[PDB]
């Protein structure tokens, strides 16, 4: 299943210089192994994944609390948003590339 608990951003989405972005997320819940709901979208009303995910299928491997996970993403050139989570506690981070 997917991690239905909210995440905390440990650091701001950084630039690697490889045309990709990197952000480290902390998982609050202890729901066991679950998939990380992260995607790159063009707008906040149509979650079309316009950005390829470099880190192949990010995962929360351990079944404990406060597990940090590193995720790498390639956003499209121009305006874009980085969405982490689902529901009302979904955090949207506007990113701009080159």
């Amino acid at each position: 299943g997917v991690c239905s608990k909210a995440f905390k951003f440990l650091g701001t989405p950084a630039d690697t210089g490889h045309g990709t972005v990197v952000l480290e997320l902390q998982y609050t819940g202890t729901d066991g192994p679950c998939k990380v709901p992260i995607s790159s979208v063009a707008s906040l009303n149509d979650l079309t994944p316009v950005g390829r995910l470099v880190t192949v299928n990010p995962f929360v491997s351990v079944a404990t609390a406060n597990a940090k996970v590193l995720i790498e993403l390639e956003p499209p050139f121009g305006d874009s948003y980085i969405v982490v989570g689902r529901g009302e506690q979904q955090i949207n981070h506007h990113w701009h590339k080159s």
Partner: antibody, heavy 122, light 108 residues
Framework: EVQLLESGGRLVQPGGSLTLSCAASGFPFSTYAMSWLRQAPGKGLEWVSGITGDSGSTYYAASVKGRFTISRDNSKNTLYLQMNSLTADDTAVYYC???????????????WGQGTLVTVSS | DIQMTQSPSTLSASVGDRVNITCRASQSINQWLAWYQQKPGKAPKFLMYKASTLETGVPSRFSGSGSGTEFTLTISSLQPDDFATYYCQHYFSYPWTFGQGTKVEIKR
């Protein structure tokens, strides 16, 4: 605009089974999470179950885990609630509810149907 | 399981009064609180989320405040269209929980 029509509520004997349906119109049902809720006659509201719309995650109240099952048919815009092992404390009006945001977890309920009446008695 | 508690359970007011309805939580909920309205023989109506943000279409005489563990819904000019029972609901943890409800009654 939005219309949620519940049907399937009736009288069933304790230990029996019953399936609820909820036909939806007026919004992109495929992209919105739905929820079943119940209100006992003259009592407060109670959340029962929710489903993501992508049918990727389901959630149930403690008193219904193992007894109830939530599902949906996106091609028919219909929400389902399979109920088994119905006790007397399951007698309530069961409501159909639409999530506020799309692609959500059913965290809240922005529109309700008129609800259907389920009676568990001998 | 967060338990929601509303106070009072019944208040009697006249058309035009300003009314407060308190809703408290057993744990700390930052602002993940919603408000619902229900008239008798009718389905509930979603009024507010985030404890302060009005749902679209809701009159501006409704307002909310509170954070953490105590919240209040406010009706700044009580209209006949507002006398009903009001429920608060949290969306902090998995088991979404409602309050007891609070019946606003016409005083005569």
């Amino acid at each position: 605009e939005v219309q949620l029509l519940e049907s399937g509520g009736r009288l069933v004997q304790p230990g029996g089974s019953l399936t609820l349906s909820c036909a939806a119109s007026g919004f992109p049902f495929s992209t919105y999470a739905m929820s079943w809720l119940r209100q006992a006659p003259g009592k407060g509201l109670e959340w029962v179950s929710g489903i993501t719309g992508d049918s990727g995650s389901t959630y149930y109240a403690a008193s219904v885990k193992g007894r109830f099952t939530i599902s949906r048919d996106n091609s028919k815009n219909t929400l389902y609630l399979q109920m088994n092992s119905l006790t007397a404390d399951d007698t309530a009006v069961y409501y159909c509810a639409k999530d506020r945001l799309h692609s959500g977890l059913g965290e809240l309920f922005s529109y309700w149907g008129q609800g259907t009446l389920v009676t568990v008695s001998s | 399981d967060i338990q929601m508690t509303q106070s009072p359970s019944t208040l009697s007011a006249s058309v035009g009064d300003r009314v407060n309805i308190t809703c408290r939580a057993s744990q700390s909920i930052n602002q993940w609180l919603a408000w619902y309205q229900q008239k008798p023989g009718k389905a509930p109506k979603f009024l507010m989320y985030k404890a302060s943000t009005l749902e679209t279409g809701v009159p501006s005489r409704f307002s909310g405040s509170g954070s953490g563990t105590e919240f209040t819904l406010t009706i700044s000019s009580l209209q006949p269209d507002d006398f009903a029972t009001y429920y608060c609901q949290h969306y902090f943890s998995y088991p979404w929980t409602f309050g007891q409800g609070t019946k606003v009654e016409i005083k005569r």
